Design a protein around this ligand. Structure first.
Ligand SMILES: [Mg+2]
Ligand SMILES: [Mg+2]
Ligand SMILES: [Mg+2]
Ligand SMILES: [Mg+2]
Ligand SMILES: [Mg+2]
Ligand SMILES: [Mg+2]
Ligand SMILES: [Mg+2]
Ligand SMILES: [Mg+2]
Ligand SMILES: [Mg+2]
Ligand SMILES: [Mg+2]
Ligand SMILES: [Mg+2]
Ligand SMILES: [Mg+2]
Ligand SMILES: [Mg+2]
Ligand SMILES: [Mg+2]
Ligand SMILES: [Mg+2]
Ligand SMILES: [Mg+2]
Ligand SMILES: [Mg+2]
Ligand SMILES: [Mg+2]
Ligand SMILES: [Mg+2]
Ligand SMILES: [Mg+2]
Ligand SMILES: [Mg+2]
Ligand SMILES: [Mg+2]
Lengths: 99, 117, 106, 65, 88
RNA sequence: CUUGAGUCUCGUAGAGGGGGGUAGAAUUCCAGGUGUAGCGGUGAAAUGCGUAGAGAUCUGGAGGAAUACCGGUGGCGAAGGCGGCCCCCUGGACGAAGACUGACGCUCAGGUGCGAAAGCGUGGGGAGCAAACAGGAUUAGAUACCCUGGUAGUCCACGCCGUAAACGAUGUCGACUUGGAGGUUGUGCCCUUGAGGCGUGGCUUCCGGAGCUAACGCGUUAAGUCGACCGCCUGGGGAGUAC
């Protein structure tokens, strides 16, 4: 379907499987997701994660590192959850909400 | 109108809205503002900026009750938890603890079917 | 003629009613040719969550070796008595005559 | 790791609240053997003992009470 | 299944000695004892199909043991099937 | 005769099965406390809900269905399948050491039973979910996808149905043939003993050798080397259709 509708739905699903089904102590901080933008093809998607812990890079760096290392696990969960064709490749990014 | 000086803020952070309500420690509510009722609709109805706007609009309606000590309980992993938290933190309030209290069942009821989009 | 661990809680408002029920049940299970290998009265304890809007329930433990009939009418009495709020009957392959961790603190 | 094998306990008492509290979180949910290093047999025994203790109100189901 | 006392008594009864647990007679006797006992179980748990699979297996193996006995020496076979009230 | 196949003894692990209880979250609803104009929903919207006071929040109650965490590149079962806890009835598997029976074995047309889900008959139940349907939208078109509702059904009892990409797309049984890394469950012996070391079984996952294969790949749980029996195939369509 349209990339933005799939973007909204995938934001919902990533937020869900990010709040509940994680066990990495590197993650935490009520990690939210501001949104996710994906290409016209649904093959690739970029998530904009927003952390809470102090914005000091020592921690948000570790958070994005853990997310990128668990991307395979999150992709498997997404593929079983949200019922689409290709299970896009995920790329996490710190959304600098404070500007 | 009275003095409690120690309240708790429920933050229902839906994927389409954000409902912040400050209540007495025994569940009796005081006031509330919504991301929708803050002059936002559609997408902006569920954006973090509108969430903090609603948080501040709700704080401005309970200040006459005289509180600056809060525990907050968030529900729903919607965008607009971070926002309202830092908002009511920037509203001169002292937050002692923030707690995830989203209702998670032990396989209670069957969820609605996935959207084919 | 199996071994059972029977742990039940009593309404705290009937705390002194406990030894009566204790000796009554032991008499019932012994008059049925069933031994009793342990009996601990942990007494009043603070619950980990409310039970009928209540805390501070009276815990009591028993270890029996008895036939199944006496055990089933015992749990029947448990059900139809209201001073007990919650009971639990489990099986054991052996006989346990030791100190429960709720009496080693004492 | 594998503390229960060192203990050699045949079974884990549900009455051993002091021991069981080391295998649940503040939330009150059981901790996976993946991080506690518990043998699978003793992890099953832990799950059963903890569920029994929860029933007898010796341990909380959740932290919401 | 059968309790230790029941099996010990049946072995002592149909067997040659106390430790003749392998003879076809004691095997058939144990099987028919367990079958008769399981009849009461299946009288009320009539949709317990897995236990019924086990029961049918033991019925079948009793049948083939009886056939082997009848082919080995018919005298003992008839004496047994009359002491147990079978094959009718 | 005892090596195959069984019986006994002592134990072990298991969501194996049937029955009956019970617990704690959550959804819904009903009644109250607090508290006021939005809630809900979408890529945007409206249908919908609320000034009779919703939504949000706390307390209490009713009811139904399913059992988070544990949870596993786990376990059990002939397969289908099986997941809170407790009791009762019950099936199978495995191990150690013996004792016993003495080929009692393997396979199996016809036959018999079991057999997801949907469906059918009778009665009950009905929270959530949801074919059909009723709307709201979108669209050239929407009888779809999306949204708000929503009946059968999903649940229980007793019968019927007997089909699935019912799959490992791999029939059952037995023997034999280099390795390596794991999981799981027994068990023997030894060390100062827990710890640890050296063994030895069952089940199971993943690499890979010879060999095999059209290739992909399989590879001691074979698709390798053999034996026993059974099922089945003979170009595509017509057609798993007609009679
Ligand atoms: Mg949205
Ligand atoms: Mg047997
Ligand atoms: Mg079971
Ligand atoms: Mg009702
Ligand atoms: Mg058994
Ligand atoms: Mg001989
Ligand atoms: Mg046939
Ligand atoms: Mg059905
Ligand atoms: Mg019909
Ligand atoms: Mg029907
Ligand atoms: Mg009906
Ligand atoms: Mg619906
Ligand atoms: Mg077929
Ligand atoms: Mg299947
Ligand atoms: Mg086939
Ligand atoms: Mg073979
Ligand atoms: Mg198996
Ligand atoms: Mg291979
Ligand atoms: Mg072969
Ligand atoms: Mg081939
Ligand atoms: Mg042809
Ligand atoms: Mg036909």
């Amino acid at each position: 379907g349209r990339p933005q509708r799939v973007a909204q739905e995938m934001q919902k699903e990533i937020a869900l499987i990010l709040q509940r089904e994680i066990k990495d102590p590197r993650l935490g901080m009520m990690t939210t997701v501001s949104g996710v933008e994906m290409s016209r093809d649904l093959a690739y998607a970029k998530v904009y994660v927003t952390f809470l812990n102090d914005k000091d890079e020592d921690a948000v760096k570790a958070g994005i590192k853990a997310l990128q290392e668990a991307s395979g696990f999150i992709r498997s969960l997404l593929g079983k959850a949200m019922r689409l064709r290709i299970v896009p490749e995920l790329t996490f990014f710190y959304d600098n909400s404070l500007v | 109108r009275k003095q409690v000086s120690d309240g708790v803020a429920h933050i229902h952070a839906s994927f389409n809205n954000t409902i912040v309500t400050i209540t007495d420690r025994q569940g009796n509510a005081l006031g509330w503002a919504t991301a929708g009722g803050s002059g936002f609709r559609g997408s902006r109805k569920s954006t973090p900026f509108a969430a903090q706007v609603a948080a501040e609009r709700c704080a401005d309606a309970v200040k006459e009750y005289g509180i600056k000590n809060l525990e907050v309980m968030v529900k729903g992993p919607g965008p607009g938890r971070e926002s309202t938290i830092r908002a009511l933190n920037a509203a001169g309030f002292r937050i002692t603890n923030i707690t995830d209290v989203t209702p998670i069942p032990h396989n209670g009821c069957r969820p609605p079917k996935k959207r084919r989009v | 003629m199996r071994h059972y661990e029977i742990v039940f809680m009593v309404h705290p408002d009937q705390s002194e009613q406990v030894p009566g029920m204790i000796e009554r049940y032991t008499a019932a299970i012994t008059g049925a040719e069933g031994k009793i290998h342990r009996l601990e009265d942990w007494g009043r304890r603070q619950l980990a969550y409310p039970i009928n809007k209540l805390h501070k329930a009276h815990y009591v433990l028993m270890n029996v070796e008895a036939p199944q009939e006496v055990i089933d009418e015992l749990e029947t009495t448990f059900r139809f008595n209201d001073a007990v709020i919650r009971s639990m009957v489990m099986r054991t392959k052996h006989a346990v005559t030791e100190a429960s961790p709720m009496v080693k603190a004492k | 790791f594998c503390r229960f094998t060192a203990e050699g306990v045949q079974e884990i008492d549900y009455k051993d609240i002091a021991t069981l509290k080391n295998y649940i979180t503040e939330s009150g949910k059981i901790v996976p053997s993946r991080i506690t290093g518990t043998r699978a047999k003793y992890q099953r025994q832990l799950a059963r003992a903890i569920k029994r203790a929860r029933y007898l109100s010796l341990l909380p189901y959740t932290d919401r009470h | 299944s059968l309790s230790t006392e029941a099996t010990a008594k049946i072995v002592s009864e149909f067997g040659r000695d106390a430790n003749d647990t392998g003879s076809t007679e004691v095997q058939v006797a144990l099987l028919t004892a367990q079958i008769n006992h399981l009849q009461g179980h299946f009288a009320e748990h009539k949709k317990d199909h897995h236990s019924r699979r086990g029961l049918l297996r033991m019925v079948s193996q009793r049948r083939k043991l009886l056939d082997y006995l009848k082919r080995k020496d018919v005298a003992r076979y008839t004496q047994l099937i009359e002491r147990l009230g079978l094959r009718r």
